[PDB]
């Protein structure tokens, strides 16, 4: 059964590597829409699904242990076609894009830390990568956004300490970019790796939402950080704020958009008929 959660203002990331002072910039890119319904998976008994991608993924998680320990991206999650694997050791992340023969229920296996329960073939990978942190920099929310454009990925990440709440708190925090990988891979399906300690696990929970092409109005303060954003298709007042390019709308009528009824069907009448030039005499002579 599903279980949803309202994501209020989440998944706003820095669109480009450009410093901007106190400036309201109106951008148009793949953003997770405001006040949306993200899906609150548990996978704990053990049941983690293979979800679609469709346009990026916003992935939040609230886990003080180390269980959500990487991801699997691909198109068939099998051999014959390539797939991407992000595993997350205690010291370094190893991204690997090979023709993995992925198992049915993939998991890591810790005591020793093995890998042979995830896949069973590693033929012909053309990309390897090693960076240090990638994860763990009261409880702490960790948010990621994956999106694959043209041929190269993009992972945005932000780890923030939060108090006890709905695990997607009412606030704002911009996501800063982490890596930028030239993979050249069609990606449409993904799922999450876990660790099982050798069977028995703790209590996982992750929040998955999907990015859509939206127009945002981001507000950069003096130090170049994003403090607020307005989604230009969430109602009328947000459309007014995106028309004015401001966040404060004083009193009065403000013309924003245009209303133009569309069509519908498409009749096409003509004239009855007349002479019918008989093929009756040429196709049917005695």
């Amino acid at each position: 059964p599903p279980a949803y959660t309202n994501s209020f203002t989440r998944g706003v990331y820095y669109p480009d590597k450009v410093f901007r002072s106190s400036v309201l910039h109106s951008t148009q890119d793949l953003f997770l829409p405001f006040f949306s319904n993200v899906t609150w998976f548990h996978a704990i008994r053990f049941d983690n699904p293979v979800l679609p991608f469709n346009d990026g993924v916003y992935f939040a998680s609230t886990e003080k242990s180390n269980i959500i320990r990487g991801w699997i991206f691909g198109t068939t999650l099998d051999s014959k076609t390539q797939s991407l694997l992000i595993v997350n050791n205690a010291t370094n992340v190893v991204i690997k894009v090979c023709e993995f023969q992925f198992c049915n229920d993939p998991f890591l296996d810790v005591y020793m830390e093995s890998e042979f329960r995830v896949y069973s073939s590693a033929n012909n990978c053309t990309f390897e990568y090693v960076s240090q942190p990638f994860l763990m920099d009261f409880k702490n929310l960790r948010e990621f956004v994956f999106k694959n454009i043209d041929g190269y990925f993009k992972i945005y990440s932000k780890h923030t300490p939060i108090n006890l709440g709905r695990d997607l708190p009412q606030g704002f925090s911009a996501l800063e970019p982490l890596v930028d990988l030239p993979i050249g891979i069609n990606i449409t399906r993904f799922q999450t790796l876990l660790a099982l300690h050798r069977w028995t696990a703790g209590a996982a929970a992750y929040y998955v939402g999907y990015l859509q092409p939206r127009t945002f109005l981001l507000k950069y303060n003096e130090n170049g950080t994003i403090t607020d954003a307005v989604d230009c298709a969430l109602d009328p007042l947000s459309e007014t704020k995106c028309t004015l390019k401001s966040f404060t709308v004083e009193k009065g009528i403000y013309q924003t958009s245009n209303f133009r009824v569309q069509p519908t069907e498409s009749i096409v009448r003509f004239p009855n008929i007349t002479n019918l030039c008989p093929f009756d005499e040429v196709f049917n002579a005695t």
Partner: antibody
């Protein structure tokens, strides 16, 4: 535990109009691009339409491109097929399908509907 | 439009026998082809995805092979619940096209 219940089938005069509705409840919906598939009585399965996860791109079959429109309402989790200018070659059983694609929709589970008998007489 | 043909469109074989069903395309579909089974009176249940990856909840009698233009559905033994109609599907070019479907029967 998945439920795809469909409605809107009945006797239609030729050249009429219908709104086939597919109420989806179970999986998450709106993360999957969903399909309309039809089967003529005594014939094989045909294909009608496909819509993406956000209602962005819609694709139709090469025989019914223009007489049908496909839409989705993610607030109530429904699929809709507006059928206008029906001929007698459209009397069928329409299924509301979620095909185990893996190239376009990127789904992984195969969830079929039940099928409505649209008789155009 | 990617036309598909299926052979043989009529088939009758007893228990324990083997059934081969060839799906032939008009264009090139690399390994993107689904094999469905529809028992008469119900919605079709999928059996094989991407022409070789058998699913979960299906017995290991069925197998799929082939690539390019020719694909093959193979039933190693006919149990009495194998009597249905089997369909293809392609995935590369929209629209997706099903096959005409082959009917398996008992002798």
């Amino acid at each position: 535990e998945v439920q795809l219940v469909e409605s809107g089938g009945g006797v239609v005069q030729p050249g009429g109009s219908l709104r086939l509705s597919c109420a989806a409840s179970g999986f998450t919906f709106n993360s999957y691009g969903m399909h309309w598939v039809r089967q003529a009585p005594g014939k094989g399965l045909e294909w009608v339409a496909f819509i993406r996860y956000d209602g962005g791109n819609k694709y139709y079959a090469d025989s019914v491109k223009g007489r049908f429109t496909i839409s989705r309402d993610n607030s109530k989790n429904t699929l809709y097929l507006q059928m206008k200018s029906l001929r007698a070659e459209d009397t069928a059983v329409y299924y509301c399908a979620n095909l185990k694609d893996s190239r376009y929709s990127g789904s992984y589970y195969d969830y079929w509907g039940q099928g409505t008998l649209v008789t155009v007489s | 439009v990617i036309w598909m043909t299926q052979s043989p469109s009529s088939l009758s074989a007893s228990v324990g026998d083997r059934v081969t069903i060839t799906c032939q395309a008009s264009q090139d579909i690399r390994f993107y082809l689904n094999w469905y089974q529809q028992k008469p009176g119900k919605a079709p249940k999928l059996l094989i995805s991407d022409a070789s990856n058998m699913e979960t909840g299906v017995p290991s009698r069925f197998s799929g092979s082939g690539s390019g233009t020719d694909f093959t559905f193979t039933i190693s033994s006919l149990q009495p619940e194998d009597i249905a109609t089997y369909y293809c599907q392609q995935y590369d070019n929209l629209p997706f096209t099903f096959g005409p479907g082959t009917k398996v029967d008992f002798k």
